[PDB]
Design a protein around this ligand. Structure first.
Ligand SMILES: NC[C@H]1O[C@H](O[C@H]2[C@H](O)[C@@H](O[C@H]3O[C@H](CO)[C@@H](O)[C@H](N)[C@H]3O)[C@H](N)C[C@@H]2N)[C@H](O)[C@@H](O)[C@@H]1O
Ligand SMILES: O=c1c(O)c(-c2ccc(O)c(O)c2)oc2cc(O)cc(O)c12
Ligand SMILES: [Cl-]
Length: 296
């Protein structure tokens, strides 16, 4: 964690001409804390080394796709420096004014506004997924089969003395079932947002139109279907019906596939909670995942 004195000092070092008048905490994620500075900029500071690589990733991707997208995205204006601890010490982005398009907010909109929102997200995704990926930096590729095998290995290392025989057999089976299913690894890899959820979609209540996409730190080259299944959850997201509208504008050509990927992903969450948990020292996510795994 950081003091305001630390943030200001960090920025002053690299941007001595930049006058800081105001600084307040803007937000906080698992990877970075955000500061709003002079009410003009969002500055992200990594909470840890791992978070710093997401920050570093966001900056590189945003630089590459700048003015290629049909909706406003953060623009990099300030960058920090690498250390032995952080790949990037901080970054300052233009602030995009607006509020998040919550499930609540969306469902209260004129049926036309909802439909237009679905159209704007579709064409945003269409152009993003169309961006030319050759000449893209290292690390950017996220091969799904590589991910699952690596995860499987991790679950095995973590849970071998935590599960009983029948319970681990269930784990093996699930991972077996995933890996022997071609549709998961068959996609054309494209540049994807990879955390495309309602809290990263900023909305203009005056125009009743989406006015920005934020938080590219998870972006990668992978399965573009990821950017639909993330919006499709019923608890914290928009739901299968609204995403379906988005799918039509996208001109999507295998929607049951999208659906099959959604359901697999929802089941898979227990395992991510174990892994993401253990890695981020979230003993709460680990125990939840562990308890879920010891069940249905
Ligand atoms: N909270 C409970 C929910 O958790 C996940 O969904 C949420 C994601 O976790 C969020 O993203 C954060 O966590 C990810 C790792 O999980 C990170 O990669 C990402 N950078 C983070 O911003 C995203 N913004 C919203 C989405 N609804 C599960 O899928 C969902 O079933 C479950 O109900
Ligand atoms: O410009 C930004 C902005 O406005 C918001 C934002 C976030 C949550 C809110 O509830 C809100 O009202 C605004 O955050 C961002 C996060 C970024 O990574 C980059 C940005 O540029 C902004
Ligand atoms: Cl300067």
């Amino acid at each position: 964690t950081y003091t305001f004195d630390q943030v200001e000092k960090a920025i002053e070092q690299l941007y001595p001409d930049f006058t800081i008048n105001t600084i307040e905490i803007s937000g906080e994620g698992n990877d970075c804390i955000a500061y709003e500075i002079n009410r003009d900029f969002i500055f992200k500071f990594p909470k840890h080394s791992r978070g710093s690589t997401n920050l570093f990733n966001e900056v590189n991707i945003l630089k590459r796709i700048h003015n290629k997208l049909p909706l406003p995205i953060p623009e990099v204006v300030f960058t920090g420096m690498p250390s032995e601890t952080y790949q990037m010490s901080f970054a300052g982005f233009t602030k995009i004014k607006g509020v998040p398009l919550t499930p609540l907010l969306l469902n209260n909109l004129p049926k036309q506004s909802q439909n237009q929102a679905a159209k704007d997200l579709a064409r945003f995704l269409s152009e993003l997924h169309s961006i030319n990926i050759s000449g893209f930096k290292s690390n950017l590729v996220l091969d799904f089969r590589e991910k699952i095998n690596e995860d499987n290995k991790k679950i095995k290392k973590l849970l071998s003395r935590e599960l009983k025989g029948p319970q681990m057999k269930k784990v093996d089976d699930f991972y077996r079932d995933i890996l022997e299913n071609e549709i998961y690894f068959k996609y054309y890899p494209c540049l994807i947002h990879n955390d495309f959820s309602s809290d990263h979609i900023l909305f203009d209540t005056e125009k009743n139109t989406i006015c920005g996409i934020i938080d590219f730190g998870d972006a990668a080259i992978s399965d573009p279907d990821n950017d639909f299944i993330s919006l499709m959850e019923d608890d914290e997201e928009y739901g299968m019906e609204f995403v379906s509208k988005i799918l039509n504008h996208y001109k999507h050509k295998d929607i049951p596939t999208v659906l099959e990927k959604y359901r697999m992903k929802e089941k898979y969450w227990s395992f991510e909670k174990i892994i993401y948990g253990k890695e981020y020292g979230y003993m709460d996510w680990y125990e939840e995942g562990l308890n879920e795994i010891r069940s249905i």
